Amino acid sequence: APDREKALELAMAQIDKNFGKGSVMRLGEEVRQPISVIPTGSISLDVALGIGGLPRGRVIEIYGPESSGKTTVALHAVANAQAAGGIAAFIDAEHALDPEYAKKLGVDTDSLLVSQPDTGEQALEIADMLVRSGALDIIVIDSVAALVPRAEIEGEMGDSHVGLQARLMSQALRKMTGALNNSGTTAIFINNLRSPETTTGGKALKFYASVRLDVRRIETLKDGTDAVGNRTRVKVVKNKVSPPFKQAEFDILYGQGISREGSLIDMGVEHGFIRKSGSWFTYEGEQLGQGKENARKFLLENTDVANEIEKKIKEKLGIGAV
């Protein structure tokens, strides 16, 4: 009577229906559920997600050490959502945001909503109120660690030494998520790994997020013998709308955001559109230059190339079909 694949597909189906799509899936699976997404500003990270970017109406945690690029991604995500005529809101509690860099990544600052809360409670509550207005495409909370409870921001004591901040974020996500789904607003929580969890309240975030990114800094782009930028690496540790555990890498130059040409050169190579013999890069017989940089330059300048590549690369994988 037993046919494992028959008995298995049935199980899996019941599981997905009991808890949602993505409750369980084969890793080698190829999701054909083109959810609505927000381009991460990183082609590789957009493929790594399996859907083309951050899914909408979802909680997204972007954790990592300081300076790893978490914010840059976040900002790009906002820019892209704005271009699709979406409205964005930034719950600030670090007071770090630089709007100039913001615009450079293509963000329309003047039209951005910014709030700088008085307490963790407030910050989340202000965020929730905005969310259920269903007018937001995306909303970014700058620091999860900064959502310190009002009982601690105040002179409160060495007595009620509780786990307060943690449940402060648990009850907050418990009610915000639902709204977020109706609203279709993507919530990106920026988590700075520097309290006993990923930054105190990221203990629930681990369970409430449909997607979790592990941003990390891995290299320092040099070109010759000097500073040009840093290569970041992201790992999709959690993905409830596509097979998780995928990885992506991209360059972010000083004062610049995620380098397009960089991505192009990277993804072109592995995908054999751009042949990279040792040192020297070449595209369709054309001389790109030796050293990832000269290639980035070459591309940055010969915009007609690098556009056919983007094309070629965009085709092979897929950008908008269904």
Curated annotation (Swiss-Prot):
Family annotation (CDD domains): RecA (cd00983)
Record's subcellular location: Cytoplasm
Positions bound to phosphate: 67-71, 192
Keywords carried by this UniProt record: ATP-binding, Cytoplasm, DNA damage, DNA recombination, DNA repair, DNA-binding, Nucleotide-binding, SOS response
Secretion signal span: none
Binding site for ATP: 67-72, 98-101
GO cellular component: cytosol
UniProt GO molecular function: ATP binding; ATP hydrolysis activity; ATP-dependent DNA damage sensor activity; damaged DNA binding; single-stranded DNA binding
A Gene Ontology biological process term: SOS response
Principal location class: cytoplasm
InterPro entries documented for this protein: AAA+_ATPase, DNA_recomb/repair_RecA, DNA_recomb/repair_RecA_CS, P-loop_NTPase, RecA-like_C, RecA-like_N, RecA_ATP-bd, RecA_C_sf
Coiled-coil residues: none
Disruption phenotype: Not essential in the absence of DNA damage, its deletion renders cells much more sensitive to DNA damaging agents such as UV light, ionizing radiation, alkylating agents and DNA gyrase inhibitors and desiccation-induced DSBs. 5-fold decrease in survival, loss of HR, no change in NHEJ (non-homologous end-joining) or single-strand annealing DSB repair.
NCBIfam families (UniProt xref): tigrfam_recA
Quaternary structure note: Polymerizes non-specifically on ssDNA to form filaments. Interacts with and activates LexA leading to autocatalytic cleavage of LexA, which derepresses the SOS regulon and activates DNA repair.
Task performed by this protein: Required for homologous recombination (HR) and the bypass of mutagenic DNA lesions (double strand breaks, DSB) by the SOS response. Can catalyze the hydrolysis of ATP in the presence of single-stranded DNA, the ATP-dependent uptake of single-stranded DNA by duplex DNA, and the ATP-dependent hybridization of homologous single-stranded DNAs. Numerous X-ray crystals have been resolved under different conditions which indicate the flexibility of the protein, essential to its function.
Family: Belongs to the RecA family.
Full protein name: Protein RecA
